[PDB]
CSV table of C-alpha atoms and ligand atoms in Angstrom, one decimal:
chain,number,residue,atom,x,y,z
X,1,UNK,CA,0.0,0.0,0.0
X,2,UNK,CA,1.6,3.6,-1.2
X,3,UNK,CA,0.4,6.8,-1.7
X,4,UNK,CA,2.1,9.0,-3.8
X,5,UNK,CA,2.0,13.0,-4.0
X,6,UNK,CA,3.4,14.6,-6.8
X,7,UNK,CA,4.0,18.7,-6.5
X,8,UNK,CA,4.9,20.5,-10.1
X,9,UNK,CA,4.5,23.8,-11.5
X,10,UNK,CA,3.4,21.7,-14.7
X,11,UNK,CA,0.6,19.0,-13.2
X,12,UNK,CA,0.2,18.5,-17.0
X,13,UNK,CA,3.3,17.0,-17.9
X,14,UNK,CA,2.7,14.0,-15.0
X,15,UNK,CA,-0.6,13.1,-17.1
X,16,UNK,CA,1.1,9.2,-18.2
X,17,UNK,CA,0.3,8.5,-14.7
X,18,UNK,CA,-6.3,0.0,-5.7
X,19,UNK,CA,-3.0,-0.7,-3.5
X,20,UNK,CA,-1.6,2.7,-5.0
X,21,UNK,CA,-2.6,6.1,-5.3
X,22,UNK,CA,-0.7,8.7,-7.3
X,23,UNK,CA,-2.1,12.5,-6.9
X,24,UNK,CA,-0.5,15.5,-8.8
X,25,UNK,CA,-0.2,19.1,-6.5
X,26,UNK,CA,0.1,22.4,-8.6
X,27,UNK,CA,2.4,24.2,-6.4
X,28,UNK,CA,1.0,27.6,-7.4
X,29,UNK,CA,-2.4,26.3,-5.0
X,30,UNK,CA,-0.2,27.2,-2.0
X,31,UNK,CA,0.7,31.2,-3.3
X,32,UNK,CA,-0.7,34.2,-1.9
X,33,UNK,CA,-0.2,36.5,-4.4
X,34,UNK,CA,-1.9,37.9,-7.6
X,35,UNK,CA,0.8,36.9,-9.4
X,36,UNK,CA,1.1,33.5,-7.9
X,37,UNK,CA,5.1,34.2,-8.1
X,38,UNK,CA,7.3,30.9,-7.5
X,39,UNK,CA,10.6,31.9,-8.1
X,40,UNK,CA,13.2,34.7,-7.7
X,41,UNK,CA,16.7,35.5,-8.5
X,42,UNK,CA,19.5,33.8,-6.7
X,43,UNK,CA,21.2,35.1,-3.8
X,44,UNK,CA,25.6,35.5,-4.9
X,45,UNK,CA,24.7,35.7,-9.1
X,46,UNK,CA,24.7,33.1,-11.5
X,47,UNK,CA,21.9,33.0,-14.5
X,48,UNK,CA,18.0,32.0,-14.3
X,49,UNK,CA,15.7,31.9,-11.0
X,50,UNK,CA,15.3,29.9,-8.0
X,51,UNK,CA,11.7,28.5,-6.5
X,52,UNK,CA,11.2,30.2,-3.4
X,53,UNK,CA,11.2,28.4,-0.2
X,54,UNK,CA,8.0,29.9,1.1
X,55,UNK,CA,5.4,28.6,-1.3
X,56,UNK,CA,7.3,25.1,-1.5
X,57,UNK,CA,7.5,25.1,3.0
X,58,UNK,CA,3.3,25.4,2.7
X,59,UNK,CA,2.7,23.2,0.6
X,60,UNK,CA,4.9,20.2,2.1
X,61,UNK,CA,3.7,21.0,5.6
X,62,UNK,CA,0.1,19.9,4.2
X,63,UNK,CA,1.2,17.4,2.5
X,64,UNK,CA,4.0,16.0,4.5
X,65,UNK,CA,3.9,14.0,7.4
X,66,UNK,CA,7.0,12.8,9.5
X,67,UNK,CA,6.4,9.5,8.3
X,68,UNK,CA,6.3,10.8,4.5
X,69,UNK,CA,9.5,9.7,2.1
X,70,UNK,CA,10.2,13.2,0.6
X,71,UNK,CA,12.0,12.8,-2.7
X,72,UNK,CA,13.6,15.7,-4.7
X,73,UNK,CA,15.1,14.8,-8.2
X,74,UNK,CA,18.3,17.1,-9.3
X,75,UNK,CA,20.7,16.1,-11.4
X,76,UNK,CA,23.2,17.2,-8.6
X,77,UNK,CA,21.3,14.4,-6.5
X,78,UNK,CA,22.7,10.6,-5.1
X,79,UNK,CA,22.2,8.1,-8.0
X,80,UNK,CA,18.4,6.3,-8.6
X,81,UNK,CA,19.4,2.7,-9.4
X,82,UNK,CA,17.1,-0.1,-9.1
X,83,UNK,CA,18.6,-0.4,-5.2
X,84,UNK,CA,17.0,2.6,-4.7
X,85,UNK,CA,13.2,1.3,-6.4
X,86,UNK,CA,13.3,-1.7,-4.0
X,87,UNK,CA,14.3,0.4,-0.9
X,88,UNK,CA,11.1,2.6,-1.9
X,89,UNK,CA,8.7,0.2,-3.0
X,90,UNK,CA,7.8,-0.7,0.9
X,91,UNK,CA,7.3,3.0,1.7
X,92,UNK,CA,3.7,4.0,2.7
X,93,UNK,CA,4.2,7.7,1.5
X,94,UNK,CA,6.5,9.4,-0.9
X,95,UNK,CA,6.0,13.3,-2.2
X,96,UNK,CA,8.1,14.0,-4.9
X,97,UNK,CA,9.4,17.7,-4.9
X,98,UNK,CA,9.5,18.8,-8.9
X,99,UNK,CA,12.0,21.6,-9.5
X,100,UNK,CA,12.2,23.9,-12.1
X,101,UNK,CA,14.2,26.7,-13.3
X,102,UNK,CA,18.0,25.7,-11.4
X,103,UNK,CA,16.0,24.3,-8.8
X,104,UNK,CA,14.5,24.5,-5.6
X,105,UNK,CA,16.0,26.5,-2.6
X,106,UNK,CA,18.0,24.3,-0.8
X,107,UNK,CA,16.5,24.8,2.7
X,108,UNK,CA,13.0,23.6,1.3
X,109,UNK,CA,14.9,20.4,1.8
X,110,UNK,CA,16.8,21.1,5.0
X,111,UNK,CA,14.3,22.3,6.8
X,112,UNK,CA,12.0,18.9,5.9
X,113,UNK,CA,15.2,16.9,6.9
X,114,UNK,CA,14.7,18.3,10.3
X,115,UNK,CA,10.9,16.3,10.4
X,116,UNK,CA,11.2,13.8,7.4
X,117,UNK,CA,13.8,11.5,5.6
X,118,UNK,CA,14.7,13.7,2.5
X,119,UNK,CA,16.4,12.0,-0.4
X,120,UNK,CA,18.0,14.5,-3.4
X,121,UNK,CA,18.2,11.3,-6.4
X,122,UNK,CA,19.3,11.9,-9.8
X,123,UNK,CA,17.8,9.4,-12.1
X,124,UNK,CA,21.1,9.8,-14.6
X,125,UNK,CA,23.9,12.3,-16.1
X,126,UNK,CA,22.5,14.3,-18.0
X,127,UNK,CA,19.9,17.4,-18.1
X,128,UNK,CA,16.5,18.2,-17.9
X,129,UNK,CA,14.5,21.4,-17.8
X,130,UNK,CA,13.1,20.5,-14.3
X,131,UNK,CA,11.7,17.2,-12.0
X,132,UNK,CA,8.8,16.1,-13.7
X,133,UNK,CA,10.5,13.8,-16.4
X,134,UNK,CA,12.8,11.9,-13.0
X,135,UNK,CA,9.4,11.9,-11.0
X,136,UNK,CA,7.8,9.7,-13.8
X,137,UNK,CA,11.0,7.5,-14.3
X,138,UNK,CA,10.7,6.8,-10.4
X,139,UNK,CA,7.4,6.3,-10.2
X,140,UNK,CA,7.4,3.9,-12.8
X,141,UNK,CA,10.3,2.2,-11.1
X,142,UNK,CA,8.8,1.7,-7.8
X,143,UNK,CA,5.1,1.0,-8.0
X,144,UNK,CA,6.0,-2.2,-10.1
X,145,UNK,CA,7.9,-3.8,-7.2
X,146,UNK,CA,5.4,-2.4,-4.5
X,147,UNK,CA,3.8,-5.6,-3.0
X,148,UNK,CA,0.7,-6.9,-4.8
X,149,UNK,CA,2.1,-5.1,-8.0
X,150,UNK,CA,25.0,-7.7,-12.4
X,151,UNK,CA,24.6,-8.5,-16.4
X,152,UNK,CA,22.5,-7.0,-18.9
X,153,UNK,CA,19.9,-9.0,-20.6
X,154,UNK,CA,20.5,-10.8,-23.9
X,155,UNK,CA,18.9,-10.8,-27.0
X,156,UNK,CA,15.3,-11.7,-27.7
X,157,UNK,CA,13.2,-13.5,-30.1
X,158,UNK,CA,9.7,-14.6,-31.9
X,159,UNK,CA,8.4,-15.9,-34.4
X,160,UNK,CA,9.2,-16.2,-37.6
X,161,UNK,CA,12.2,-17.8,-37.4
X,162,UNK,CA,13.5,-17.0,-40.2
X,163,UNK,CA,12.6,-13.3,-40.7
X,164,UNK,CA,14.2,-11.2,-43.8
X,165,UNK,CA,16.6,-13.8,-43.9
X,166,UNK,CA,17.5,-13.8,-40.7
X,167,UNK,CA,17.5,-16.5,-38.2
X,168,UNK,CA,16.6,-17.4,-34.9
X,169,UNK,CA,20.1,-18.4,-33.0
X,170,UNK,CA,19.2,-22.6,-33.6
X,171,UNK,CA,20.0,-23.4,-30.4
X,172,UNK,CA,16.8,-21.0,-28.7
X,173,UNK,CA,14.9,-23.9,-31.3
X,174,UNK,CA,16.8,-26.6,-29.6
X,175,UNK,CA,14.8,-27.2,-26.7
X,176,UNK,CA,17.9,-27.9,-24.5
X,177,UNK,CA,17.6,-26.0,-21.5
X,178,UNK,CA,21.1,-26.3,-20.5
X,179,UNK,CA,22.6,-25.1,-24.1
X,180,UNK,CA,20.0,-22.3,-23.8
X,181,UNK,CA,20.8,-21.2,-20.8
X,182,UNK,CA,24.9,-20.9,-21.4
X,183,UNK,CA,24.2,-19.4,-25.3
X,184,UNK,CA,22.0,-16.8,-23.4
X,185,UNK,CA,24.5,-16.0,-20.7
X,186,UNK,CA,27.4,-16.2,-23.2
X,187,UNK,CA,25.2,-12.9,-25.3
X,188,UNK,CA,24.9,-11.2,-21.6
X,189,UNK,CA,28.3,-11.6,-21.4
X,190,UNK,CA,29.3,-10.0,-24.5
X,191,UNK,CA,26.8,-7.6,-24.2
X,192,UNK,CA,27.9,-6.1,-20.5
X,193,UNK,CA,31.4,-5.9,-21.7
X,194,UNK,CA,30.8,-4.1,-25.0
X,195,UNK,CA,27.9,-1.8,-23.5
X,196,UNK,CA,28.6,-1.3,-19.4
X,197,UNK,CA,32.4,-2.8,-18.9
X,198,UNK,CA,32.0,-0.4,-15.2
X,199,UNK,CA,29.1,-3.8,-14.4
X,200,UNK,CA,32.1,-6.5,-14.2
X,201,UNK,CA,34.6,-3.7,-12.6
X,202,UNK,CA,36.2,-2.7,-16.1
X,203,UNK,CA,36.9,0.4,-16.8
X,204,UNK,CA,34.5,2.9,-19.0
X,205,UNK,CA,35.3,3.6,-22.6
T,1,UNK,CA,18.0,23.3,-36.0
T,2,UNK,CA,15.1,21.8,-37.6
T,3,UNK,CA,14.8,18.1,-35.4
T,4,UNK,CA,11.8,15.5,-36.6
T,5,UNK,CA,10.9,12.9,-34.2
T,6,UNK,CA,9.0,10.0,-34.5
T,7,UNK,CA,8.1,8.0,-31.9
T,8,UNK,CA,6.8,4.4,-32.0
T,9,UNK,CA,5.1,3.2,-29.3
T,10,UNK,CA,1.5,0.8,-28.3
T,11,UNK,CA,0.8,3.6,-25.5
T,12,UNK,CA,0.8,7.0,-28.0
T,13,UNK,CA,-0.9,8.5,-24.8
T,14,UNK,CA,2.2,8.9,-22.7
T,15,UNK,CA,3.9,10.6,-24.9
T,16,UNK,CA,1.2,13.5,-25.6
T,17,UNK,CA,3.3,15.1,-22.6
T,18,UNK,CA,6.2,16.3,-24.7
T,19,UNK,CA,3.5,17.4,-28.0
T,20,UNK,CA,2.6,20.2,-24.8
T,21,UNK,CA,5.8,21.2,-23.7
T,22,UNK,CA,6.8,21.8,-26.7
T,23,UNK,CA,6.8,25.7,-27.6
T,24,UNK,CA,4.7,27.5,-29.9
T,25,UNK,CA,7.6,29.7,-31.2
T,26,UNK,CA,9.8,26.7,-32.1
T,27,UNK,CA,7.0,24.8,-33.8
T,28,UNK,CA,5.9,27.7,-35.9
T,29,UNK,CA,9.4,28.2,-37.0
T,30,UNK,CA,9.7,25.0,-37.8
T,31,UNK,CA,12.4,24.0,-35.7
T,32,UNK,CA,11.2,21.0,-34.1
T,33,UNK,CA,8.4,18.6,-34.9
T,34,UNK,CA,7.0,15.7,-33.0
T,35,UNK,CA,5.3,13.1,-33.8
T,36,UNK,CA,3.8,10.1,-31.9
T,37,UNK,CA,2.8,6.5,-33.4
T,38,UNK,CA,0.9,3.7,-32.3
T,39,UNK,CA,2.6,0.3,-32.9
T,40,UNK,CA,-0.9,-1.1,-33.7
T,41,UNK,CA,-1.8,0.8,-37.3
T,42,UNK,CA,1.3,-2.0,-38.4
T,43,UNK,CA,-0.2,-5.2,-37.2
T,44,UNK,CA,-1.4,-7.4,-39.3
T,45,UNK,CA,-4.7,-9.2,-38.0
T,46,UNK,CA,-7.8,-8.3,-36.5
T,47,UNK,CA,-6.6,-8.9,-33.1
T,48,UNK,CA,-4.0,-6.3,-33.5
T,49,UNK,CA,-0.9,-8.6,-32.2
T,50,UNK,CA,2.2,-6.7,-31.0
T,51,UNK,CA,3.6,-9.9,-28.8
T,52,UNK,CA,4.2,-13.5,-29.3
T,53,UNK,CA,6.0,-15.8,-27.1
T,54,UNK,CA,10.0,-16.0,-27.0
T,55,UNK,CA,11.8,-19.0,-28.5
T,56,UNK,CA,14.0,-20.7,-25.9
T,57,UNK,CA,10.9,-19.9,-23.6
T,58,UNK,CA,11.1,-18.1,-20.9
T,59,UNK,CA,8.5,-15.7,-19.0
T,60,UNK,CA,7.1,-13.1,-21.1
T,61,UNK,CA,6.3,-11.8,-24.4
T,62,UNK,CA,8.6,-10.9,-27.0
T,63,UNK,CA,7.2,-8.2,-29.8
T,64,UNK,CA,7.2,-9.0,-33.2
T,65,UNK,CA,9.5,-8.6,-35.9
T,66,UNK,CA,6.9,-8.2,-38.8
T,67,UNK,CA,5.3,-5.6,-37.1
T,68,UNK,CA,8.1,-3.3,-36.0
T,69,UNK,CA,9.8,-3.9,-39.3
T,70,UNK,CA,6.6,-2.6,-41.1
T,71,UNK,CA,6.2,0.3,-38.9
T,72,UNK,CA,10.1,1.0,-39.3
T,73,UNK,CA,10.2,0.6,-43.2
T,74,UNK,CA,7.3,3.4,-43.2
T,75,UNK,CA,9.1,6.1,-41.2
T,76,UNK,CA,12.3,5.7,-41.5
T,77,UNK,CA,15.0,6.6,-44.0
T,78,UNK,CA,18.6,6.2,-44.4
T,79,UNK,CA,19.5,9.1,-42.7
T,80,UNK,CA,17.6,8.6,-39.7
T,81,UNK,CA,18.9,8.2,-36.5
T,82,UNK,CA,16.9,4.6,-34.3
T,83,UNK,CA,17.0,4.8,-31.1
T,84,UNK,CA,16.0,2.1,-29.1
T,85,UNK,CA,16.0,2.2,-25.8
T,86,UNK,CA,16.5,-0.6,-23.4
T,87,UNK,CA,17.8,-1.6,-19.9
T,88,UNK,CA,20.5,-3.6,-21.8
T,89,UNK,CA,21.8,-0.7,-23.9
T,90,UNK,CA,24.5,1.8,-23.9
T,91,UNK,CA,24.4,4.9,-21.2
T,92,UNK,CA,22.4,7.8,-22.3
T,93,UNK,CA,24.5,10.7,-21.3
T,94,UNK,CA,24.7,14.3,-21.5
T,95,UNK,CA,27.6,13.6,-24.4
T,96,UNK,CA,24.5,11.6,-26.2
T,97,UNK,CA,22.1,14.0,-26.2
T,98,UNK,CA,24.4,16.4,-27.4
T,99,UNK,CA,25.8,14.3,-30.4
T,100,UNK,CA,22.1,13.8,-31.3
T,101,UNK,CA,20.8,17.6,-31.3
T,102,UNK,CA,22.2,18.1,-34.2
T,103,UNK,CA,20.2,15.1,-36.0
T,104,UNK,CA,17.6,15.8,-38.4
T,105,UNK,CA,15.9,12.7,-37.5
T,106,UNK,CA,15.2,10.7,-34.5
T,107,UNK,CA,13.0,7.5,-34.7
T,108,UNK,CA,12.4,5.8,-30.8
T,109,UNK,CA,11.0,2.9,-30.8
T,110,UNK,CA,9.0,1.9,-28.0
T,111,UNK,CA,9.7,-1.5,-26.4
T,112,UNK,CA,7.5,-3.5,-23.8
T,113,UNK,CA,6.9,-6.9,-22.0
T,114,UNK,CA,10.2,-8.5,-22.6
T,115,UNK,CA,11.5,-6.0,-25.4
T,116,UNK,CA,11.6,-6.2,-29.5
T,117,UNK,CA,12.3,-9.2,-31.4
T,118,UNK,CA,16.6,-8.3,-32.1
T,119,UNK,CA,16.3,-8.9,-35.3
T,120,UNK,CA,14.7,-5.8,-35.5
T,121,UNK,CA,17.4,-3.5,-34.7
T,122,UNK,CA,19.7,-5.9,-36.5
T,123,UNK,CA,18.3,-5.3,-40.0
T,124,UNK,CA,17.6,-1.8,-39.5
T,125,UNK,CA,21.5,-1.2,-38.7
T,126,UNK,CA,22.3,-2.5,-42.2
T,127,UNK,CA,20.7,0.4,-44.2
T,128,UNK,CA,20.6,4.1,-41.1
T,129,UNK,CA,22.4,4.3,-38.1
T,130,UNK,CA,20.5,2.2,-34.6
T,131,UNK,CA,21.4,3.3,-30.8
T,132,UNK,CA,20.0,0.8,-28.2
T,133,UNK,CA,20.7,3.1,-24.9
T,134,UNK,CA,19.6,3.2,-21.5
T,135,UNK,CA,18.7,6.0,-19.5
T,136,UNK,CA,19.8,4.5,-16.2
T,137,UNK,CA,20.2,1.6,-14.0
T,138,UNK,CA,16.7,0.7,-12.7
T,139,UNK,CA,14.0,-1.4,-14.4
T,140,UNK,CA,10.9,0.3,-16.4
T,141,UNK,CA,8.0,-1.5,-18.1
T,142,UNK,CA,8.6,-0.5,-21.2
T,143,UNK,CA,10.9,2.2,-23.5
T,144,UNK,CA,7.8,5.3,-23.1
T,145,UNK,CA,9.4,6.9,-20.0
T,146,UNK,CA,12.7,6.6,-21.8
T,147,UNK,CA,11.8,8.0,-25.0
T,148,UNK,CA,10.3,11.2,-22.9
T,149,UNK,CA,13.6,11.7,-21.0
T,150,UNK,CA,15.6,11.2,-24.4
T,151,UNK,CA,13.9,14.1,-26.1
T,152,UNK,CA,13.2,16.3,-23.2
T,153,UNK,CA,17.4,16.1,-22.7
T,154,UNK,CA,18.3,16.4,-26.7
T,155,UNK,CA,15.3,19.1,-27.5
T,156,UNK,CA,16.4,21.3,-25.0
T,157,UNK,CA,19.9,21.6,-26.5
T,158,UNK,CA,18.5,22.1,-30.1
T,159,UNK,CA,18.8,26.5,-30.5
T,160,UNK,CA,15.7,27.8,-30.3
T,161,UNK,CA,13.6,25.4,-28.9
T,162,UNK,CA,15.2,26.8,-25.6
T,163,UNK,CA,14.3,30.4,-26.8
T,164,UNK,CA,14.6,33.4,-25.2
T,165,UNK,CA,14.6,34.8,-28.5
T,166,UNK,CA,32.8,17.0,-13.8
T,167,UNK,CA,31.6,18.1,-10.6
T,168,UNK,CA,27.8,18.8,-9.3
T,169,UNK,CA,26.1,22.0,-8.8
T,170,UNK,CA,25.9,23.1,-5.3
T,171,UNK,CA,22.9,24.4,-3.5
T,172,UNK,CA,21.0,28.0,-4.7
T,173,UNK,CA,19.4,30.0,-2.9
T,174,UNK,CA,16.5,33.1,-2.8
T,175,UNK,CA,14.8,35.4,-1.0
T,176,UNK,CA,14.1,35.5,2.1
T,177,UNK,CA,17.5,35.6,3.6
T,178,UNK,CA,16.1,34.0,6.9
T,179,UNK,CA,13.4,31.1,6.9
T,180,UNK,CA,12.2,29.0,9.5
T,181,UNK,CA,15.7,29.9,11.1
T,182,UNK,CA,18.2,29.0,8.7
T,183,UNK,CA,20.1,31.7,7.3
T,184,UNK,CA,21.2,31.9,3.3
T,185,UNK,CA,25.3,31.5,3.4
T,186,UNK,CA,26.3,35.0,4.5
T,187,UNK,CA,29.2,35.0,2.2
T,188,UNK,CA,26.5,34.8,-1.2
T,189,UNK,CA,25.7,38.4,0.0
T,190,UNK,CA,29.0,39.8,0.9
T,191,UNK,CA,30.0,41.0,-2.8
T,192,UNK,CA,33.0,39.3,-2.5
T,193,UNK,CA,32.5,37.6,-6.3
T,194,UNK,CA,35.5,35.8,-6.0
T,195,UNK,CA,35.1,34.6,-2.9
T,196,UNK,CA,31.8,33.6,-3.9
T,197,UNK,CA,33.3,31.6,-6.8
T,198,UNK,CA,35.3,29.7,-4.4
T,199,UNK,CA,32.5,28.7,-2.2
T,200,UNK,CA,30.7,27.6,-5.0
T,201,UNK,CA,33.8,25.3,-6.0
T,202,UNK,CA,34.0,23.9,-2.6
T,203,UNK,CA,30.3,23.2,-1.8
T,204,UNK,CA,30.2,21.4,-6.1
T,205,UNK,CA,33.8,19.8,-4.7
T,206,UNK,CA,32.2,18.8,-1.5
T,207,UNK,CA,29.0,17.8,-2.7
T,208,UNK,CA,30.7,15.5,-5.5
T,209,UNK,CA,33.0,13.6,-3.1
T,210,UNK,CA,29.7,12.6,-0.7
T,211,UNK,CA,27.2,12.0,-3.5
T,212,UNK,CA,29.6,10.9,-6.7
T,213,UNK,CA,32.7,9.7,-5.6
T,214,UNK,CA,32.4,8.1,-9.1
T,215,UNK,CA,33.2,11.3,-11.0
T,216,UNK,CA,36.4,11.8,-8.9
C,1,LIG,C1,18.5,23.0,-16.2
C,1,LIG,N1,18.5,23.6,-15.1
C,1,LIG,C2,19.7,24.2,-14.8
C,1,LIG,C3,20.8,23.4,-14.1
C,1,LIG,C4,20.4,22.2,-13.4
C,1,LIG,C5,19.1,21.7,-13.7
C,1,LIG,C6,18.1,22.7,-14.1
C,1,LIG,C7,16.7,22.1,-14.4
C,1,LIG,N2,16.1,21.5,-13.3
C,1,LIG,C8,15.4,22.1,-12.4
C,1,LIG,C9,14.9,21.2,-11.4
C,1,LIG,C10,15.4,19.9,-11.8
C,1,LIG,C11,15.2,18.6,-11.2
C,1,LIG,C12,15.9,17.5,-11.8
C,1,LIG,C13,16.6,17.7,-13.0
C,1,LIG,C14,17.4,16.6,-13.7
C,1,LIG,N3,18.1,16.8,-14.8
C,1,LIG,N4,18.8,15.7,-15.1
C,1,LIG,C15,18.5,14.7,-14.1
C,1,LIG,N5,19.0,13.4,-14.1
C,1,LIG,C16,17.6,15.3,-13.2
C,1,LIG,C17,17.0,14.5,-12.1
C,1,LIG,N6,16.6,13.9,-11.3
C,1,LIG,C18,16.7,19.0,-13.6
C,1,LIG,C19,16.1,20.1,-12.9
C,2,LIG,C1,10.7,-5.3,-17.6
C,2,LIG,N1,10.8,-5.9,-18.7
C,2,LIG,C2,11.6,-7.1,-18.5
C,2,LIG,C3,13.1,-7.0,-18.5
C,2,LIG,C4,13.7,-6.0,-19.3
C,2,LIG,C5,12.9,-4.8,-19.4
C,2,LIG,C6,11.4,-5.1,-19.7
C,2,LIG,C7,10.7,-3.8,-19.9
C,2,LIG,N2,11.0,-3.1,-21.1
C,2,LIG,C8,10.5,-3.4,-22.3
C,2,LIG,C9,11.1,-2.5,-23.3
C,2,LIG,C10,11.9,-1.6,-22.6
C,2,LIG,C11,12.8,-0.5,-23.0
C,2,LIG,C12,13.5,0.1,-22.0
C,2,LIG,C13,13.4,-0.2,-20.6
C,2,LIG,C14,14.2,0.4,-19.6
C,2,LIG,N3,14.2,-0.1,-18.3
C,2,LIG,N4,15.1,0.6,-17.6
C,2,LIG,C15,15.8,1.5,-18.4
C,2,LIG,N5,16.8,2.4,-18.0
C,2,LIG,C16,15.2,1.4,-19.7
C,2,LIG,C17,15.7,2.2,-20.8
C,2,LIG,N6,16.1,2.9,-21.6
C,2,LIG,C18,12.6,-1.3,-20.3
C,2,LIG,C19,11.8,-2.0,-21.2
């Protein structure tokens, strides 16, 4: 059982979302004024805007409990890896924080950590325009392993097979286990050399 | 640049998302277009068949070739660029998205259940250049959340569709200079730019050690 609150400037873009419950939060709900103004320029210089912590402290405190998971992508954030998704799926409650501009004033998140585990998690290196593209990468990562819900994988294959002129490997026709098993793990191996060498403690191209 | 992408997929719905985001100004110029396909308008019965089982068995479906390879022969050309994600491919990094924003054409095909038939990829990599990538090291159903995080990182280095017309970051900071008792680093409001500079090196060199030790 997991309930999930997502908080965005852009409830739109989290649209591709009975023991789960995923609900989208437009920050601007929690402004005061006419403007509903979320961001301002950052203290010491440097180029675009920072979201304020004000509207961002409201809207956590009613959302947030000290029980709540609160999870805030950046790509300056600890790595996402499928350790991660397992560690989460058991969670009763996680609010997912989506930045925008260069991101969210950092005592937004240092001022939950005083009530609530906070976890900054980048879901890979490179860059987005804000959190909403990581928020459905996680999401989509975790509620499959919720409850109730080392090598990279070879090759696969259907029918035909023989296809443009190209065959099925005979020995997935075979029907020997054992010699499937080794031709498959022998592709995996290949495979995690060529593509992700860092797997098997190599180092990266 | 002017960027086409098609994107191939049996849940067109998830990727309405990035059709939104998109800006008016770059479509209109005619800087970026995207489109979105459903894998289905290439089956081939009434049933509308995307899956089959895989040979050497094994639990899950495996799509088909003669679908995909339809769909592909239709919208692609010899100078597009495939990219096919997957949790077995190559990293998708900031260096890839860069290499691709200059592309005139992206095709992403859309895996699910167990992935696409290989000999997919395999025959199209004999007449335009194929990418199987992944976007990181967790498991997703299927390539759809991929494919959005692939053009969201690529478009947004393409000029214009931007606009206006290593080491990790550290932390930023706004007004108010207090809240709820925590005080923005004096030293960001001292005027002291190099000084400044140098905090911000050691709070990205700080930060890098304790969440990336891999980058060092
Ligand atoms: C561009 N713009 C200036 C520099 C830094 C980032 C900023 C955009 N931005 C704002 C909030 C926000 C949250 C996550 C991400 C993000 N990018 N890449 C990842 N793997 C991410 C995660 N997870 C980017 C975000
Ligand atoms: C689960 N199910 C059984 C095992 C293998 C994967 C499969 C699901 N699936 C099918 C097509 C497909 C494409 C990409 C991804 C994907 N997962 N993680 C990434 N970083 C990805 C990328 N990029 C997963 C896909």
């Amino acid at each position: 059982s997991m309930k999930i609150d997502v908080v965005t400037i852009f409830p739109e873009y989290l649209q591709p979302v009975g023991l789960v419950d995923v609900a989208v939060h437009d920050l601007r709900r929690w402004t005061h004024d006419v403007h509903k103004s979320v961001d301002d320029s950052p203290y010491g210089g440097g180029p675009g805007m920072v979201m304020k912590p004000t509207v961002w402290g409201d809207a956590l405190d009613e959302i947030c409990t000290s029980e709540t998971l609160l999870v805030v992508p950046t790509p300056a954030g600890y790595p996402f890896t499928q350790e991660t998704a397992w560690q989460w799926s058991t969670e009763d409650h996680l609010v997912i924080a989506c930045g925008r501009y260069e991101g969210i004033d950092q005592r937004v998140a240092d001022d939950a950590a005083t009530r609530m585990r906070v976890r900054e998690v980048s879901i890979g290196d490179y860059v987005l325009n804000g959190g909403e593209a990581a928020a459905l990468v996680i999401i989509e990562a975790v509620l499959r392993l919720v409850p109730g819900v080392s090598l990279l994988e070879g090759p696969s294959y259907t029918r035909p097979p023989s296809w443009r002129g190209m065959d099925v490997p005979p020995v997935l026709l075979s029907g020997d286990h054992a010699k499937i098993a080794a031709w498959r793990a022998e592709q995996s191996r290949q495979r995690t050399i060529e593509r992700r060498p860092d797997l098997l403690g190599f180092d990266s191209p």
